[PDB]
Ligand binder design. Structure first.
Ligand SMILES: *CCC(=O)N(C(=O)[C@@H]1COc2ccc(Cl)cc21)c1cncc2ccccc12
Ligand SMILES: *CCC(=O)N(C(=O)[C@@H]1COc2ccc(Cl)cc21)c1cncc2ccccc12
Lengths: 301, 305
């Protein structure tokens, strides 16, 4: 029993964090086998990146300009290449702590753990979701660039995010481990703004099912709804549309609790109309949207 | 920017988790040097949990009855002893992954990270607080017994909790690493209930300072109060008393934000008497009490391990 925001154990990722220094810029790198991955803006200064030409700046660099530190050991860079917004530094030592891993690109609404690092040293671990506007609401300071997001489903680490920047609203933007940004963002100091954010509807429903599994039923009602009537109400509260894919995904939780998805959808409509009235659900006074249907099944069952 | 519930990196603890099996019971153990620590209820069966004489049950056990597994390697137990509600299994091999560590007993209001395990395998990490009623609002299923709570100071792991049981309300009870329970609980199947809980006042104040650091100021006011007038109001709302020690602990955050502790207390007083009025603080509609003043400074300064 109980429901907590839970991160994956960070040990397999801690053994991969290194510090990458180029000129006056220092950030974090991910050391896997004989390659260190890091944001390409490590080659810029603060005045170089209103409009940086990364191909032009990288060609002027030599292997000995990149200082890589793993613990109190300096690694030797023997090659460098760029793949989209990530820099790949080939090193002369394979990381002996390299876990079984994959690079996966996630979709909005998906969750992952973040290992926040400064100077190649892990400082904390927390749980995050890729917002529908492709930003993440992280907790990051100056020097966190290169910190990674990941999931550990059975022995293998799936790296899904690398931190690159903070937008003016305090939210964060980054790329997958192939250097492709999530969202319409660029690794430039140019004026960029996160689009209006929306609530991850399928995740809220999964979390209402988690509350029923934990014995909370106060918010349930005798109503059902059509999927279209639900979406018409949902859009009015800045909630993401719920597709038939989401309804199918919620099937196992529906079968376990005995409550049809469209029945839970009618409870959600009622909560949005009434509020909580001094009550809480799983210790929260707001509807939580950073637990996926897969997270709920894993934590509850 | 941003404020998250953040746990310590769990790597130093992951290298210590093992599976302990005794008869039909399987739970987790903490392998440090040549000793495996686990809840003493691992030796219990049916009526052994209802009315247990643990000295009597342990004397009947032999070293080979305890199966300890570290990864896909079976460890051999060469001795066994009991210290309060913890069983100590002496093994032939010192854990090569043993970090620098200490056993510390924490006070209510203090926070720690929990590495939830099943079958000696870490499955999740979360940050939580020792409630004033000595329970933890954790997230644990069958098989989680022996999961540990810890903090990190520099490169030293301070183990402060070992999970033993779940109470009928869904809250959790356990011991320090010396086997002494937190709270008025016993390790047996019997009627036990958590006492009425209270809010950790000093932690709420620390979290209001974290919100100010992140640009959330709507709740601030021109007012200040006395520690005695605040404690009168606090008692009325099931809030823990705020001592001069807490006021001193909040000093650095007070200096950084320019909001004196008794000034932040007047803001907290109005929040209790009037509510949030549809507004949120750090994305929450409730006052959060599981971040200590040290947690707030650590996260709003980027201390690493
Ligand atoms: C790694 C720290 C850092 O430089 N951060 C940035 O956002 C930089 C500054 O301006 C930028 C524009 C574009 C890019 Cl791709 C990168 C940066 C950074 C990252 N995460 C959180 C931060 C919080 C405060 C200050 C800087 C932060
Ligand atoms: C390790 C699993 C376990 O046995 N749990 C208990 O709470 C047991 C059952 O009854 C008990 C009475 C006294 C003690 Cl000392 C231990 C137990 C366990 C632990 N944590 C969470 C659980 C959730 C669901 C079921 C069992 C749980």
């Amino acid at each position: 029993s109980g429901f907590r925001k839970m991160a994956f154990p960070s040990g397999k990722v801690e053994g991969c964090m290194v510090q990458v220094t180029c000129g006056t810029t220092t950030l974090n790198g991910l050391w896997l086998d004989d390659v260190v991955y890091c944001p390409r803006h490590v080659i810029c200064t603060s005045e170089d990146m209103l409009n940086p030409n990364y191909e032009d700046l990288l060609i002027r660099k030599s292997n000995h300009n990149f200082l890589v530190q793993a613990g109190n050991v300096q690694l030797r860079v023997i090659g460098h290449s760029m793949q989209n917004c990530v820099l790949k530094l080939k090193v002369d030592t394979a990381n002996p702590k390299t876990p079984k891993y994959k690079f996966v690109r996630i979709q909005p609404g998906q969750t992952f753990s973040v290992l926040a690092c400064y100077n190649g040293s892990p400082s904390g671990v927390y749980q995050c979701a890729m917002r529908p506007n492709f930003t993440i609401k992280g907790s990051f300071l100056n020097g966190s660039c290169g910190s990674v997001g990941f999931n550990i489903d059975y022995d293998c680490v799936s790296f899904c995010y690398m931190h690159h920047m903070e937008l003016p609203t305090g939210v964060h933007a980054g790329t997958d481990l192939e250097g492709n940004f999530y969202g319409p963002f660029v690794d430039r100091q140019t004026a960029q703004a996160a689009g209006t954010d929306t609530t991850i509807t399928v995740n809220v429903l999964a979390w209402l099912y988690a509350a029923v599994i934990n014995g909370d039923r106060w918010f349930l009602n005798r109503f059902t709804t059509t999927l279209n009537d639900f979406n018409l109400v949902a859009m009015k509260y800045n909630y993401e549309p719920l597709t038939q894919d989401h309804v199918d995904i919620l099937g196992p939780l529906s079968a376990q609790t005995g409550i049809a998805v469209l029945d839970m959808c009618a409870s959600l409509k009622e909560l949005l109309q009434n509020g909580m009235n001094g009550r809480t659900i799983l210790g929260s006074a707001l509807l939580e949207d950073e637990f996926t249907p897969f997270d709920v099944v894993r934590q509850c069952s």
